[PDB]
């Protein structure tokens with residue numbers, strides 16, 4: 100009964116109003132947002148490793164929310180909050196501009212079929228919305244195990260003034276410590292790891 104037990108402590112309800120991060124987290128500290136955290140393994144690991152920072156997760160799949168809460172409770176985390184609501188609405192309504200150190204989007208629904216391509220969350224307007232919530236120097240880190248989606252993500256992100264690709268080859272980045280290795284990955288495999296990480300830093304507009 101993880102939801103029932105831990106939602107009152109770590110859950111954050113949808114609101115028409117902006118979040119006050121100091122009020123929510125009881126301190127002034129960097130805030131990282133993970134969108135679509137699934138069962139929250141990455142988010143819990145990240146919060147556990149960074150007690151000095153604060154973490155917000157959003158996930159519409161409520162069993163994933165419950166799994167994340169159960170794990171967060173088991174790990175004794177005080178620096179994690181979760182939401183169960185459309186992330187785009189949360190960004191629009193509740194996340195203040197220029198407030199986030201990092202936004203993570205790991206394995207967003209890849210929508211393999213061409214007819215479903217518009218359902219993919221990484222599109223220009225979404226990426227711009229995320230950018231507006233990053234502090235300058237903040238980073239949007241996404242990952243996918245589907246190359247067509249990786250290429251699409253790269254095209255979207257490369258087209259937006261104010262995002263600087265942190266890839267030294269102008270495409271993809273090495274997996275950072277802040278994303279755990281997954282089962283979709285053969286690290287060091289001759290044909291590639293099987294997961295594409297993209298990281299872009301928010302920089303001042305060039306135009």
Ligand SMILES: C[S@@+](CC[C@H](N)C(=O)[O-])C[C@H]1O[C@@H](n2cnc3c(N)ncnc32)[C@H](O)[C@@H]1O
Nearest residue numbers: 135136137157158159160185186205206207208
């Ligand atoms: C393929 S799963 C990956 C989950 C997790 N990051 C992982 O790697 O295991 C994609 C997740 O994104 C969530 N998701 C899709 N759209 C969302 C949205 N608009 N707001 C919040 N979560 C969303 C889904 O519910 C799903 O759990």
